[PDB]
Ligand binder design. Structure first.
Ligand SMILES: CC(C)C[C@H](N)C(=O)NS(=O)(=O)OC[C@H]1O[C@@H](n2ccc(=O)[nH]c2=O)[C@H](O)[C@@H]1O
Ligand SMILES: [Mg+2]
Ligand SMILES: [Zn+2]
Length: 832
C-alpha cells in the first residue's frame, strides 16, 4: 500500500473500476429490489456550479447507501436543454443554441464523471434531441384530440420596438427591458393544458404524500387555491338599470367564501370591465378615467394601493333588503369568475382598509367570545372563521360558520338568489412560447381544415438546429422552409405552428423517459414503467416546489389516464437541499482570484448565495483540481445538514482533506503493523473490556449511520459518528491477536459506512483491507450482542443481587424487595 493519500491518482482509477464493473448500469432486474433515486437534472448552461455538486452528491449518498443494502439502484442524469440560456448565448456570441448546448453537455458531463457519482450514463437524455421531444409532441396531439389541450386567445406583452413578445419578467414598469418602449397587450391564439379539470385530483392526492415536507404540500394547496363558497346575486335596483341589458340588467352576481357574513355587507365592488362599470361611466368621465387607469396597470395585488370610485348605482342584498352602492375597484379582476365581489369591512381586512380610506360603513355580524369590537381598528379575530358565531343576523343569530353557510345556502336557493360553488385560484397552463429554442408545437394550420394535429407517424416535427436567433422575433416565423408544409387532412398547402412549448413540458415527464430512454414506440415502455414504478426519492431546490412539481404530478396523471404508467404520483420522497453561499469581493471579483487578507487588494464584501450576479460561485473544477472529488463531497456533506445553507469555507475544505489523509493514514499504519486478518465476528465473551467497548462503539456507530442515511437523511452527523469511532479506536490498544481482529472489524465497517460520502478513498482502502467485492460484502450489520453491557435491611447487610446495567431505580428496589427503600445505583439498595 502506498503510504500517502493521492486523490488525483486514486480517484480516476476507482471510477474506471466502477465503470468497468458496470455497477451503476442497471437493467429491469426482477431478481433485485428496485430503488429509483433522482436528482433534478440541470440546464446545460456551461459548467457545474458548487450548488450542482451539493444537490448531486446528496443524491449519490442515498443511491450508494441503497446499493450497499442490495437494491437495484437507478440514478439517472440528463440535460434540461431547451430554453432561453441558449438563446441569449446565441445572441451574445453569434452561435447556434444547439451547438452551444452540446458543448456545455460535454463539459458538464465530464465534470459530473470526475466527481464519481454512481450514475447510469446509459440512460442519459438530452431534451433538445428529437429522440426525446417527439413523445411530448405525441402526447400533445393525443390530448389535443381529447380537448385536454386546446387553443384560444390569450393576452401577451408586445414590445413594439424589439418586435417580440415579452414575459412579465422583462416588462419593467410597463416597458420593454431592452427598449423601454411602452408595452402593448395583444390577443393572440395560444395553446393551453386544461389543468383545471384535474385541480381536485391534484389537491387531494397530496394527502397520499406522507413522505413530503409539509410546507411543500402547503405551497401546492395554496397555489391550487381551492375554496368552497357561495354564488350570490343582488338584484339591480329600479333606478340603476340605465344602459344595462340581459341578465346584467337584472342582478349583480358575486362569489364569496364568507356567505355567513352576507348580512354585514356594506357595499359591492366590480371590475373596471364589468358592464355596470361601463354603463355608469357614460355621463361620468370621472369613472371613465378610473376605468382607464385600471386596465393600464395576484402578483402585485398584495403590494398595490387599493382604490375605488362610487357609481351612483345600487343593488339589493337578497337577505336583508339593504340597498348598497356599487364601486369600481382596482382590486377586482375581470376573469376570476363573476368579476364582482361583495364587501364586509367588519370581517375582511382588505375591505376594512378600503372602507377606512373612504369612510364606508362597517357592520359587525360575527362575534368571537367576549372580544371587544372597535370599528376604528382592525384585529385578527374579526376574520375568525372557526370560533365565531353570528351577530345581528336575525334568523341566523347564534350559528357558527358551517351552519350559517348551510342556512344561507338554503335561503338563497329557496329565493333563487344564489347557490354553493367551488372555485380555484388555479388557471389553465399556457404552453405557447414565441421563442426559437424549444419543442415545436405539432399543429398545422390549414385554411380549409383549421388547426390540425400532426399524425403520429409524422412525429417529430424537427426543430431546425441550423439557426442563430437575434432577438427580433422567433426565426421560425421567418423560415418558410420550416413553416410551409401540406395539410395532413386534405393535402393542400398549409403552415406549421411556429410557437414552441413551455420548457417546463420537458421536465414534466423526464423521470419516466429515464426508465426506457431508447424506447421508440412510446413515451415509456410498459415493461419499464411496471418495473420502476415511481421515483422513490427526489432531490432538488425549493424554487421548483410549486410549478415544476405540480406540472410533473399533472403529467403523471395524464400519462396514467393514457395507460402509459400505473402510478398516481411521480415522487414518493422529496428532499430540498439548501443553497451554497459564499463571500463576495469588489466590478465584482470571483473568490478564486482575490488578494485574500492584482496589486492593490479588493473589498471583502458580504456573503450570499453563489450566483453570477455578484460573481461569487466557486468553480468545482478548481476545487477538484486542488483537492479531488472526495474532499469536495466530504466538505459539503459535513458542513451542514443538507437542508441548511452551506457556507463556503477554505478551512472547511482543508479540514475535509486532512480527515481523508487521516483515514488513509489509519489504514496504512494498521496494515504496516502486521497485514490484514479476519475481522472479529461471533461471541465476544473473553474479549477485554477495552475491546468490548470498542465493539460497542462500532455497532452503535453502524446503527446511527444507518438511521442518519436511511431515516433522518442527515449526513453531517453520520460523518461525525464515524469520526467518534475512529477517535475511540485511536485510544484503544489493538496490538494483540484479538485486538488486531477487532481493529480489522472497525476499519472494515468505517470504510463501508463512509463509502456513500467518499467512495474513491473507501473503495481503495477497502481492497487493501479485504479481498471481496465491497458491494457484495454490503452494508455493515449491527451486532446486537456487542451492544449489551455487563451486569453490575435497615443497616446491616443481608444479601446481594445481580443487576442489569440498564436497571432503573424501580428494578433495584424490586430485586431488593425479593432477596432473602433508599437506592444508590451500582452500590447499595437499603430498605429501612
Ligand atoms: C427539474 C427541472 C425543472 C430542473 C431544472 N433543469 C433546473 O432547475 N436546473 S438547474 O441546473 O438550475 O438546477 C438543477 C438542480 O441543481 C440545484 N442547484 C443548481 C444550481 C445552484 O446554484 N444550486 C442548486 O442547488 C437546483 O436547485 C436544482 O435542484
Ligand atoms: Mg402510502
Ligand atoms: Zn386541410
Amino acid at each position: 500500500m502506498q503510504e500517502h493519500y493521492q486523490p488525483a491518482a486514486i480517484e480516476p482509477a476507482a471510477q474506471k473500476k466502477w465503470d468497468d464493473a458496470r455497477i451503476s448500469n442497471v437493467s429491469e432486474d426482477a431478481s433485485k429490489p428496485k430503488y429509483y433515486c433522482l436528482s433534478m437534472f440541470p440546464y446545460p448552461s456551461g459548467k457545474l456550479h458548487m450548488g450542482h455538486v451539493r444537490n448531486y452528491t446528496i443524491g449519490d449518498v442515498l443511491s450508494r447507501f441503497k446499493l450497499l443494502n442490495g437494491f437495484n439502484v437507478m440514478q439517472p442524469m440528463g440535460w434540461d436543454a431547451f430554453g432561453m440560456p441558449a438563446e441569449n448565448a446565441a445572441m451574445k456570441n453569434n452561435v447556434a443554441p444547439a451547438a452551444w448546448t452540446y458543448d456545455n453537455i460535454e463539459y458538464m458531463k465530464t465534470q459530473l464523471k470526475s466527481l464519481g457519482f454512481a450514475v447510469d450514463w446509459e440512460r442519459e437524455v438530452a431534451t433538445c434531441k428529437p429522440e426525446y421531444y417527439r413523445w411530448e409532441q405525441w402526447l400533445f396531439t393525443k390530448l389535443f384530440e381529447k380537448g385536454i389541450v386546446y387553443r384560444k386567445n390569450g393576452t401577451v406583452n408586445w414590445d413594439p420596438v424589439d418586435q417580440t413578445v415579452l414575459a412579465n419578467e422583462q416588462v419593467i414598469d410597463g416597458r420593454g427591458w431592452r427598449s423601454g418602449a411602452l408595452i402593448e397587450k395583444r390577443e393572440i391564439p395560444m395553446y393551453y393544458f386544461k389543468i383545471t379539470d384535474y385541480a381536485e385530483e391534484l389537491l387531494n392526492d397530496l394527502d397520499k404524500l406522507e413522505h413530503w415536507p409539509e410546507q411543500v404540500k402547503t405551497m401546492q394547496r395554496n397555489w391550487i387555491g381551492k375554496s368552497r363558497g357561495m354564488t350570490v346575486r343582488f338584484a339591480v335596483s329600479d333606478d340603476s338599470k340605465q344602459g344595462l341589458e340581459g341578465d346584467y340588467a337584472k342582478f349583480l352576481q358575486v362569489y364569496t367564501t364568507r356567505p355567513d357574513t352576507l348580512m354585514g355587507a356594506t357595499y359591492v365592488a366590480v371590475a373596471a370591465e364589468h358592464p355596470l362599470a361601463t354603463a355608469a361611466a357614460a355621463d361620468k368621465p370621472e369613472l371613465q378615467a378610473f376605468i382607464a387607469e385600471c386596465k393600464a396597470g395576484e402578483a402585485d395585488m398584495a403590494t398595490m394601493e387599493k382604490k375605488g370610485v362610487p357609481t351612483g348605482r345600487y343593488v339589493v342584498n337578497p337577505l336583508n333588503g339593504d340597498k348598497l352602492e356599487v364601486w369600481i375597484a382596482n382590486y377586482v379582476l375581470w376573469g376570476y369568475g363573476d368579476g364582482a365581489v361583495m364587501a364586509v369591512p367588519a370581517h375582511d381586512e382588505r375591505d376594512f382598509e378600503f372602507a377606512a380610506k373612504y369612510n364606508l360603513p362597517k357592520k359587525q355580524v360575527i362575534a368571537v367570545g367576549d372580544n371587544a369590537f372597535d370599528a376604528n381598528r382592525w384585529q385578527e379575530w374579526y376574520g375568525d372563521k372557526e370560533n365565531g358565531v353570528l351577530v345581528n343576523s336575525g334568523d341566523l343569530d347564534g350559528l357558527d360558520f358551517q351552519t350559517a353557510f348551510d342556512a344561507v345556502a338554503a335561503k338563497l336557493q329557496s329565493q333563487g338568489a344564489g347557490e354553493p360553488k367551488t372555485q380555484y385560484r388555479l388557471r389553465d397552463w399556457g404552453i405557447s412560447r414565441q421563442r426559437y429554442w424549444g419543442c415545436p408545437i405539432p399543429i398545422v394550420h390549414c385554411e380549409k381544415c383549421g388547426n390540425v394535429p400532426v399524425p403520429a407517424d409524422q412525429l417529430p416535427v424537427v426543430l431546425p438546429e441550423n439557426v442563430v436567433p437575434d432577438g427580433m422575433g422567433s426565426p421560425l416565423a421567418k423560415m418558410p422552409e420550416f413553416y410551409e408544409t401540406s395539410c395532413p387532412c386534405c393535402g393542400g398547402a398549409a403552415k406549421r405552428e411556429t410557437d414552441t412549448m413551455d420548457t417546463f413540458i420537458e421536465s414534466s415527464w423526464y423521470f419516466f423517459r429515464y426508465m426506457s430512454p431508447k424506447f421508440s414506440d412510446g413515451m415509456v415502455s410498459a415493461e419499464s414503467a411496471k418495473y420502476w414504478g415511481a421515483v422513490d426519492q427526489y432531490i432538488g431546490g425549493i424554487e421548483h416546489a410549486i410549478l415544476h412539481l405540480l406540472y410533473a404530478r399533472f403529467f403523471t396523471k395524464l400519462m396514467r389516464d393514457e395507460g402509459l404508467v400505473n402510478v398516481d404520483e411521480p415522487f414518493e420522497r422529496l428532499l430540498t437541499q439548501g443553497m451554497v453561499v459564499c463571500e463576495t469581493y469588489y466590478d465584482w471579483i470571483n473568490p478564486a482570484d482575490v488578494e485574500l487578507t492584482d496589486g492593490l487588494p479588493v473589498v471583502i464584501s458580504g456573503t450570499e448565495k453563489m450566483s453570477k450576479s455578484k460573481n461569487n460561485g466557486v468553480d468545482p473544477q478548481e476545487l477538484i483540481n486542488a483537492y479531488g472529488a472526495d474532499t469536495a463531497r466530504l466538505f459539503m456533506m459535513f458542513a451542514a445538514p443538507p437542508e441548511q445553507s452551506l457556507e463556503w469555507s477554505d478551512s472547511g475544505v482543508e479540514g475535509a482533506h486532512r480527515f481523508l489523509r487521516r483515514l488513509w493514514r489509519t489504514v496504512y499504519e494498521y496494515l504496516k503493523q502486521g497485514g490484514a486478518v479476519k475481522a472479529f465476528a461471533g461471541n465476544q465473551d473473553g474479549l477485554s473490556k477495552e475491546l468490548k467497548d470498542l465493539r460497542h462503539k462500532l455497532h452503535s456507530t453502524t446503527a446511527k449511520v444507518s438511521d442518519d442515511y436511511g431515516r433522518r437523511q442527515q449526513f453531517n452527523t453520520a460523518i461525525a459518528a464515524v469520526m467518534e469511532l475512529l477517535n475511540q479506536y485511536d485510544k484503544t490498544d489493538t496490538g494483540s491477536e484479538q485486538g488486531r481482529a477487532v481493529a480489522q472489524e472497525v476499519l472494515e465497517a468505517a470504510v463501508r459506512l463512509l463509502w456513500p460520502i467518499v467512495p474513491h478513498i473507501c473503495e481503495t482502502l477497502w481492497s487493501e483491507l479485504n479481498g471481496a467485492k465491497l458491494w457484495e460484502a454490503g452494508w455493515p450489520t449491527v451486532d446486537e450482542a456487542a451492544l449489551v453491557k455487563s451486569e453490575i435491611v435497615n443497616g446491616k447487610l443481608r444479601g446481594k443481587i445481580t443487576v442489569a446495567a440498564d436497571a432503573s431505580k424501580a428494578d433495584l428496589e424490586a430485586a431488593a424487595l425479593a432477596n432473602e427503600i433508599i437506592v444508590v445505583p451500582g452500590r447499595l439498595v437499603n430498605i429501612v
